[PDB]
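Dear support,

Our group has been running a series of protein-ligand predictions, and this particular one with IJB is the one our PI (initials K.S.) wants archived with full inputs and outputs. We had some confusion internally about which version of the output was final, so please treat the block below as the authoritative record. The input we submitted was:
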Amino acid sequence: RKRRRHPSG
Amino acid sequence: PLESQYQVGPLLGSGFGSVYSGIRVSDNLPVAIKHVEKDRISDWGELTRVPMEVVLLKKVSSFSGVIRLLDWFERPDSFVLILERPEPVQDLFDFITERGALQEELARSFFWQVLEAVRHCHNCGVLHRDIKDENILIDLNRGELKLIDFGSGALLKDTVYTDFDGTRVYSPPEWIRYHRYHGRSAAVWSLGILLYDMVCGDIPFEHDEEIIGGQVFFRQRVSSECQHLIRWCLALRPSDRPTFEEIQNHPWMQDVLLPQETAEIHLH
Ligand SMILES: Nc1ccc2c(c1)NC(=O)/C2=C/c1ccc(C(=O)O)cc1
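Confirmed final output from the archive:
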């Protein structure tokens, strides 16, 4: 499955 | 002068942030040069009025598990932060992307070092509030982890927080439901997300409903002891979560590798 970064905010 | 003390190299990292590789001319110390726009600064502190990030970095700048602030400059529209840059490094997010789920021995060593680093922050009066694999560097030669980017942090307090600027998918359910949390128990929740991430290869929750749902499905083979530690960190009720001491006394956490052992066995 799609692993992704997650920006802060 | 700013452009006279440092040789400024290329941009670092993997978005809308501005951190440059650099070397200090005095002694060729590798540095990271972080530019922060005044107009984008959330909270301000005082020493001289500076971004809170500078205040927090100064408080933890003693111990090598946290990024060290070496200096800072003010400019018309920005502040510039000179951070001590380890090398060679990869951040933990890319590390897990490339290697998949980590062996528990390796995750134990990593998680332990993150615990020691966060304990150091709290002992210094600093709450990071954005613990995640993207904010952790791995010194691939020494096997040492570094917590970075205190740009969402706050002074540690014992009363309730009602603001939050970190990463939503690492935030606890009391933040999702009620927009409040206490610092330590919120930190422990994010540490549970982080530990799951390490031993399963990705974070457990992507949507608010999963975060508040309080069910942890394991997608990889994970030892019963590790599963129990993770589920404990992700207790829905904050006061049900372990303290740092209870985490580090958990049976899964015993017999940790030293950093150098970690590098020789798993990183070299
Ligand atoms: N993926 C990735 C992310 C960061 C860095 C990197 C690669 N290589 C580096 O040397 C970094 C240095 C660094 C240190 C501190 C801070 C901060 O405190 O915000 C940001 C970046």
